[PDB]
Design a protein around this motif. Structure first.
Motif, PDB file in Angstrom:
ATOM      1  N   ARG A 146       0.977  -1.913  -7.489  1.00  0.00           N
ATOM      2  CA  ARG A 146       1.223  -3.052  -6.618  1.00  0.00           C
ATOM      3  C   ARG A 146       2.675  -3.494  -6.697  1.00  0.00           C
ATOM      4  N   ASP A 147       3.180  -3.682  -7.914  1.00  0.00           N
ATOM      5  CA  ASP A 147       4.546  -4.168  -8.073  1.00  0.00           C
ATOM      6  C   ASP A 147       5.553  -3.074  -7.739  1.00  0.00           C
ATOM      7  N   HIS A 148       5.133  -1.815  -7.867  1.00  0.00           N
ATOM      8  CA  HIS A 148       6.015  -0.684  -7.604  1.00  0.00           C
ATOM      9  C   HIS A 148       6.392  -0.591  -6.133  1.00  0.00           C
ATOM     10  N   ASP A 149       5.500  -1.024  -5.246  1.00  0.00           N
ATOM     11  CA  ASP A 149       5.809  -0.965  -3.825  1.00  0.00           C
ATOM     12  C   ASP A 149       6.462  -2.248  -3.343  1.00  0.00           C
ATOM     13  N   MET A 150       6.244  -3.357  -4.047  1.00  0.00           N
ATOM     14  CA  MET A 150       6.888  -4.601  -3.648  1.00  0.00           C
ATOM     15  C   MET A 150       8.378  -4.563  -3.957  1.00  0.00           C
TER      16      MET A 150
END
Ligand SMILES: CCCCCCCCCCCCCCCCCC(=O)OC[C@H](COP(=O)([O-])OCC[N+](C)(C)C)OC(=O)CCCCCCCCCCCCCCCCC
Ligand SMILES: CCCCCCCCCCCCCCCCCC(=O)OC[C@H](COP(=O)([O-])OCC[N+](C)(C)C)OC(=O)CCCCCCCCCCCCCCCCC
Ligand SMILES: CCCCCCCCCCCCCCCCCC(=O)OC[C@H](COP(=O)([O-])OCC[N+](C)(C)C)OC(=O)CCCCCCCCCCCCCCCCC
Ligand SMILES: CCCCCCCCCCCCCCCCCC(=O)OC[C@H](COP(=O)([O-])OCC[N+](C)(C)C)OC(=O)CCCCCCCCCCCCCCCCC
Ligand SMILES: CCCCCCCCCCCCCCCCCC(=O)OC[C@H](COP(=O)([O-])OCC[N+](C)(C)C)OC(=O)CCCCCCCCCCCCCCCCC
Ligand SMILES: CCCCCCCCCCCCCCCCCC(=O)OC[C@H](COP(=O)(O)OCCN)OC(=O)CCCCCCCCCCCCCCCCC
Ligand SMILES: CCCCCCCCCCCCCCCCCC(=O)OC[C@H](COP(=O)(O)OCCN)OC(=O)CCCCCCCCCCCCCCCCC
Lengths: 96, 96, 112, 113, 172, 168, 344, 80
Positions: free
Chosen positions: D80-84
């Motif tokens: 999740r945080d990797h794409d944000m």
């Protein structure tokens, strides 16, 4: 929910009878085969939420290839362009 | 053209007041089997002029379930007359 | 345009001979007793048509054997084809799929 | 978000893994420890220290499954945080740099009672 | 003989349904379907696909319409009557009968009236609209029925019918 | 759209019937082979049959000379050949199989042709680089541009699950 | 009879897989066609004349609800001819789609599909099998999701709990009290579906668990609320404590885990500046609790165990998978920081 | 068991004749080399039209003249 088993293991359960230009057992295409292949070329990696407002040209003619909506209206109004002037000359063309 | 308006007007052989009412329930199961051929035809007019070459196996398969479906529904309508002798949709005992 | 004038001849010759044989001497001048003697040898018969179970299962059983001959119908058109190991092994399936539906029901038919 | 229809994909190797003596894994199966005691209490046992072989394998069940379940929970926040942060990294016009202003700039309300 | 032979069939087919959609005493309900089933097959026997129309006689009109009349004797065997000899039948027959003409009345009999009711015109010869011609393969519609590619299709519909008997081998 | 004139029409049209066209028909296609096979590339490999009108006359003009040759040299067995095959019903080829060699008694010899038994109507050929290869097809307008990707580095949760309070 | 009872029962869940494993509207037609073919025997088994007059009220309600779906396919067959399961390209099709499918899941209109079937089927045993038919069309609304009118899907869902709530305060028959509050728990999940369509499945997986464990508790003798009195001091007093715990859990009270959905589902419903929409529904499920209180006021307060009949023998039914249901249906509220990252 | 194929054929030789034709029908396509000629005949019957190709570098085979020794072996049927 859409499990999508048939993408993991490579059998086609169906997938072939879906769209208008897929296989054609003895290679006889449809009446709008040229616009299917052109329109699917537009939105492939596009996530379809921007495709509704960006592509918008290759879809609209394809809708109008299939029903011939304004082609039949440009034809119908020529029956009212002439054909009140039946008696006012201009047979156009004489036979043949 | 007008070959689709008639028949899309003829899809209103459901009409729900006469899809379960009034009594002689055979009159209601009648239009359940007669609601087909407003789907069997309305599909067949579209697959056939626009040469899809593959989806025309689907109108063949459209009958095969709806025959087996209605045959099941006709089995139970004997069971309502096996216990009575008359179907008569104004039979109601299990309230709601 | 004769298909369609190949049969409307045949039905208007059919409905011709009915009304001439039936309805034309039905206006004749005989005595014509209209008394309720017209029914033969079952005089009154004050009953409703009773249900018969062994003559209902004959209707449904035929209907479920009638469907999958229409699946079986395009077998001669399935000859001039591509890949035919598929075409043979699938054609043999439906017949066996019709055959098992016998053998389960065959353990209980009744006096049909 | 690619590589569809996996329980947990290949790319979850560089995640810690969530090793044991974490209190959730103690708690997962603690309810199973409570559940096996119920399993006697339904049937008029009348023990409440009954057959241990039924009172075991509940502990083995939840802890194994709950461990093998948690390896994708920590994956899904990690993806999740990797794409944000990538969409933060591109498009700087959607992410301005605010000005640092101390309390010599603000004249707030001022509402005393 | 006219160009309007398709449109003149379908109005009968629309009026075939209104025959049995109201309440005709279910032995004239058979005389609403066999009328419509043939007239409906009169539409489908144009456009090229004749095999797909002739099956509607064999499997629908030949199969289901016997059993639908092989009942209404073993059940619902009260003293029969005819429709239109009562007051509840005729009151609903006329209700769509006007609109069966009224829809035709202004869809194109006016020049163009006005914007919303003129996009689809009656006729003319663009109802088929299939020029030009093809090849010696089939119609086609002819090379369409396949024990090729579709195998998952047939393996369900074969097996869905096999439980169709076992559900009816019981309760009755 | 724009169309060519009433000129580049009205060419010398082969006005024959169906059976006499199907009479020879077999010796015909298997020995001309320059204007017609290249005309297929002019129709398949590039579409829009409004551009391709030259070789539509190249196949036609040579076919005018094919029947002009057969009239002068040997037409006495020819006219009786399509006589019997016009005795109709499906135009079978096993009825006049007897009378086929009386036509072909000299077509192999007098004017010197051949019998293309079954090698014809298959065996896809090449012709020559004749027109410039029509790249940039019918429109081929735009792609358009895709969405850029992320590879990055997979590091775990920043302070843990961040839901309501939920430390770890 | 025994082996063929599995093959009927096996193909029910085989009917619903093809609904999910499909890229083609023809196969999703076959999918819950044969479910409507293979439920009708399970209605029958002991052949009582209410059951035959109940499945036939079940039948044609799911024949038309089938039949409008195939009408919705053939409309957008005419428009662009793609048959993948996706947005339907026509507002006259999607309108006819959603309120056709609203009969199989039955919403607040298309009303009496739910009480008139489930009441009085002599097979009260299960009829847990009415959780598949809530599971097949929800797997269809996951894909159709970005093509709806956003008013109809809420108006069937705002009416859902306002009329699934009021309907059962006037009841005794605890099958109807289970049949009611089964429209209500279809009201919470399709009010959310336009906004982030996952965190809908969280409500559904909870709903399968808490309802399946309710019927297994009921399979000792229980028929009516007055019969729900006479087993505290007779069958097992631990049953009375258990049947308290699940109801108070299924009402949504924050010491238990039926408060797990709402607590999370309002995190999505606001965050979308929609505040008057949850405040109506959150105060609406309050008189969905006055079923459960006034049901718990029967068994847990020794209300008249008369007509002295002794069950001096033990119990041997099959309470299958029962020991693990009220240990994940009550105690999970601390242990789910992310259930919505497994299911997402 | 060897009497069972002779003491039911004295009672009902009706379905026995069916299984005897049901069998020896699935078995034989795995046996004779006449099959796969049934797919070899069925492959070289031309329905559609043979479109040509273009020379570009290769030139693999099959020049502009069809009656040259250019194409594959489908001429064993005329000898058949
Ligand atoms: C051939 C298919 C056989 C399996 C059929 C199973 C029958 C259907 C059972 C329905 C139960 C309801 C569960 C719904 C939630 C799914 C559980 C889950 O989150 O894991 C799925 C996981 C994760 O799915 P995913 O991340 O790969 O993509 C699918 C995401 N959804 C489900 C939202 C569309 O899939 C598996 O790998 C299964 C193990
Ligand atoms: C109490 C009812 C509400 C429960 C809310 C959740 C409680 C824990 C919240 C802590 C925040 C967090 O980050 O959790 C991760 C924490 C992180 O670990 P930690 O380092 O913060 O340690 C916290 C330990 N406690 C909770 C006791 C203060 O790990 C957990 O999952 C919590 C472990 C214990 C969970 C079970 C507690 C039992 C007592 C409450 C039982 C209530 C269950 C329902 C009973 C019916
Ligand atoms: C294995 C698949 C092949 C398809 C065959 C389908 C059944 C064909 C009928 C077999 C006839 C055998 C007749 C003699 C059997 C000996 C009598 C006996 O002891 O009863 C055994 C019987 C054979 O069945 P039965 O048909 O002979 O009589 C049983 C009575 N009824 C039908 C009411 C149950 O075996 C069983 O009862 C269990 C099977 C249940 C019903 C069969 C459907 C499922 C088949 C298994 C999967
Ligand atoms: C989730 C997927 C859907 C599961 C819901 C249950 C559907 C299973 C259908 C068969 C069950 C059944 O009918 O049993 C009743 C039957 C009743 O049948 P019966 O006893 O009345 O009739 C049979 C007659 N004899 C015995 C003679 C043959 O048995 C039971 O009462 C208990 C057996 C199992 C009950 C269900 C256990 C599973 C339910 C928990 C699922 C938990 C899912 C967690 C999700 C996360
Ligand atoms: C079962 C193996 C099938 C594959 C075998 C491969 C080929 C082998 C060549 C034949 C070998 C001999 C076959 C053994 C026949 C034994 C069956 C028997 O005796 O019948 C007993 C019983 C006889 O019971 P009965 O006492 O009621 O006899 C009445 C028989 N009739 C109706 C003919 C008067 O028959 C059956 O149980 C099965 C009847 C249904 C058969 C369905 C036919 C299938 C259609 C073709 C597929
Ligand atoms: C939180 C962490 C995640 C939780 C998911 C863990 C997976 C499910 C674990 C529970 C397993 C239950 C079990 O093992 O059976 C319990 C019990 C059988 O007990 P047993 O040891 O066999 O004693 C027999 C003495 N006669 O059962 C019985 O009494 C009857 C026998 C039936 C056996 C149970 C069958 C289910 C096992 C697979 C479960 C998979 C589906 C999960 C459904 C519940 C999910 C919460
Ligand atoms: C010690 C266990 C209780 C004493 C022995 C068992 C006596 C008994 O059978 O009563 C069970 C009782 C249920 O109450 P009730 O049914 O009303 O009483 C009639 C019982 N015939 O109460 C029960 O024990 C039912 C089971 C309830 C859940 C387990 C709690 C029992 C306590 C023992 C486990 C302790 C560890 C788990 C709790 C840890 C808390 C930190």
């Amino acid at each position: 929910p859409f499990f999508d088993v048939q993408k993991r293991l490579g059998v086609d359960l169906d997938r072939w009878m879906t769209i208008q230009s897929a296989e054609q057992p003895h290679k006889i295409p449809s009446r709008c085969h040229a616009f299917e292949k052109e329109w699917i070329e537009c939105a492939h990696g596009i996530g379809s939420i921007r495709a509704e407002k960006e592509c918008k040209i290759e879809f609209e003619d394809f809708r109008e290839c299939l029903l011939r909506q304004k082609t039949m209206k440009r034809l119908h109004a020529i029956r009212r362009q002439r054909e009140k002037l039946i008696k006012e000359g201009k047979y156009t063309p004489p036979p043949h | 053209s007008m070959v689709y308006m008639n028949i899309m007007m003829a899809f209103t052989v459901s009409l729900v007041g006469l899809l379960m009412y009034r009594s002689h329930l055979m009159s209601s199961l009648l239009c359940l089997e007669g609601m087909m051929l407003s789907l069997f035809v309305m599909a067949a007019l579209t697959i056939l002029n626009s040469h899809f070459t593959l989806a025309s196996m689907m109108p063949i398969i459209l009958l095969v379930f709806a025959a087996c479906e209605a045959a099941l529904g006709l089995s139970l309508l004997v069971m309502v007359s096996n216990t009575y002798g008359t179907d008569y949709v104004q039979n109601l005992n299990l309230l709601q | 345009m004769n298909l369609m004038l190949a049969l409307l001849t045949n039905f208007t010759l059919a409905t011709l001979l009915v009304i001439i044989a039936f309805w034309l001497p039905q206006l004749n001048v005989y005595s014509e007793k209209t008394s309720p003697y017209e029914c033969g040898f079952d005089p009154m018969g004050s009953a409703r048509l009773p249900f018969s179970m062994k003559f209902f299962l004959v209707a449904i059983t035929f209907l479920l054997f009638d469907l999958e001959i229409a699946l079986l119908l395009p077998l001669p058109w399935a000859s001039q084809t591509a890949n035919l190991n598929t075409m043979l092994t699938m054609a043999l399936f439906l017949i066996i799929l019709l055959a098992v539906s016998l053998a389960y029901e065959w353990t209980q038919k009744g006096l049909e | 978000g690619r590589a569809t229809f996996q329980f947990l994909p290949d790319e979850a190797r560089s995640l810690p893994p969530p090793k044991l003596t974490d209190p959730r894994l103690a708690f997962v199966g603690f309810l199973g420890y409570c559940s096996g005691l119920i399993d006697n209490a339904i049937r008029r046992r009348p023990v409440l220290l009954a057959g241990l072989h039924r009172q075991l394998l509940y502990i083995t069940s939840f802890v194994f499954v709950g461990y093998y379940l948690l390896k994708r929970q920590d994956y899904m926040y990690a993806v999740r945080d990797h794409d944000m942060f990538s969409y933060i990294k591109s498009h700087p016009e959607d992410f301005p740099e605010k000005d640092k202003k101390t309390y010599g700039e603000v004249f707030e309300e001022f509402h005393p009672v | 003989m006219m160009l309007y032979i398709v449109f003149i069939l379908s109005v009968i087919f629309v009026m075939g349904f209104v025959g049995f959609s109201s309440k005709p005493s279910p032995i004239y309900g058979g005389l609403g379907l066999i009328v419509s089933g043939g007239v409906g097959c009169g539409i489908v026997l144009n456009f090229g696909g004749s095999f797909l129309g002739l099956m509607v006689f064999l499997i629908y009109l030949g199969g289901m319409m016997v059993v639908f009349g092989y009942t209404t004797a073993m059940a619902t065997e009260q003293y029969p009557e005819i429709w239109l000899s009562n007051k509840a039948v005729l009151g609903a027959f006329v209700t769509g009968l006007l609109m069966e003409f009224f829809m035709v009345y202004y869809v194109l009999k006016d020049k163009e009236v006005e914007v919303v009711f003129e996009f689809n015109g009656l006729g003319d010869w663009v109802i088929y609209d299939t020029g030009d011609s093809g090849f010696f393969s089939e119609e086609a519609m002819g090379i369409a029925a396949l024990y090729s590619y579709g195998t998952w299709l047939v393996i369900v519909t074969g097996w869905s019918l096999l439980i169709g008997v076992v559900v009816i081998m019981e309760i009755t | 759209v724009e169309l060519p004139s009433l000129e580049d029409l009205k060419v010398q049209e082969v006005k024959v019937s169906s059976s006499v066209l199907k009479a020879a028909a077999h010796h015909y296609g298997a020995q001309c082979d320059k204007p017609n096979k290249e005309f297929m590339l002019c129709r398949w490999e590039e579409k829009d049959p409004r551009r391709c009108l030259e070789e539509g006359k190249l196949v036609n003009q040579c076919a005018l000379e094919f029947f002009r040759q057969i009239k002068r040299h040997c037409a006495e067995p020819f006219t009786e050949y399509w006589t019997c095959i016009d005795y109709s019903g499906l135009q079978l080829f096993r009825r006049c199989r007897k009378q086929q060699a009386q036509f072909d008694e000299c077509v192999l010899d007098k004017l010197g042709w051949v019998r293309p038994d079954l090698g014809d109507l298959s065996k896809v050929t090449k012709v020559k680089t004749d027109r410039p290869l029509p790249e940039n097809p019918y429109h081929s307008r735009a792609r358009p541009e895709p969405n850029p990707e992320v590879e990055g580095d997979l590091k775990p949760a920043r302070h843990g699950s961040r839901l309501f309070f939920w430390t770890m | 009879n025994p082996i063929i009872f599995i093959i009927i029962l096996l193909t029910i869940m085989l009917g619903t897989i093809i609904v999910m494993i499909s890229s083609h509207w023809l196969l999703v037609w076959i999918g819950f066609e044969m479910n409507m073919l293979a439920i009708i025997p399970i209605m029958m088994k002991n052949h009582n004349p209410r059951a035959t007059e109940a499945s036939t009220k079940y039948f044609l309600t799911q024949s038309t609800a089938s039949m409008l779906l195939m009408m919705a396919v053939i409309i957008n067959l005419m428009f662009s001819g793609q048959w993948t399961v996706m947005k339907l390209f026509n507002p006259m099709a999607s309108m006819l789609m959603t309120m056709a499918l609203a009969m199989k899941l039955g919403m607040a209109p298309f009303h009496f599909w739910v009480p008139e079937v489930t009441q009085g089927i002599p097979l009260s045993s299960g009829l847990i099998l009415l959780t598949w038919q809530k599971l097949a069309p929800m797997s269809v609304l996951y894909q159709i999701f970005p093509s709806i009118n956003l008013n109809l899907i809420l108006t069937l869902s705002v009416l859902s709990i306002l009329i699934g709530g009021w309907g059962g305060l006037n009841q005794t028959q605890l099958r109807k009290i289970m049949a009611y509050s089964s429209i209500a728990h279809m009201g919470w999940m399709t009010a959310v579906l336009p906004y982030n369509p996952t965190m809908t499945l969280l409500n559904l997986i909870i709903y399968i668990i808490m309802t399946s464990t309710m019927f297994t508790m009921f399979m000792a003798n229980s028929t009516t609320t007055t019969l729900s009195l006479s087993h505290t001091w007779n069958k097992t007093p631990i049953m009375t404590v258990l049947i308290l715990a699940t109801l108070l859990s299924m009402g949504g009270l924050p010491p238990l885990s039926g408060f797990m959905p709402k607590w999370m589902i309002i995190q999505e419903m606001t965050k979308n500046n929609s505040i008057i929409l949850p405040t109506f529904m959150a105060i609406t499920a309050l008189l969905n609790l006055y079923f459960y209180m006034r049901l718990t006021y029967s068994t847990t307060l020794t209300m008249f165990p008369s007509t002295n009949n002794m069950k001096m023998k033990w119990q041997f039914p099959l309470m299958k998978k029962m020991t693990f249901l009220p240990t994940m249906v009550v105690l999970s509220t601390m242990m789910l920081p992310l259930t919505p990252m497994l299911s997402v | 068991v060897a009497a069972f194929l002779k003491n039911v054929w004295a009672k009902e030789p009706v379905l026995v004749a069916s299984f005897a034709i049901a069998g020896l029908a699935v078995i034989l396509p795995t046996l004779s080399p006449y099959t796969k000629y049934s797919l070899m005949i069925n492959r070289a019957t031309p329905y559609n039209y043979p479109v040509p190709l273009r020379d570009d570098g290769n030139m693999p085979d099959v020049p502009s003249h069809p009656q040259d020794p250019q194409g594959p072996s489908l001429e064993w049927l005329k000898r058949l």
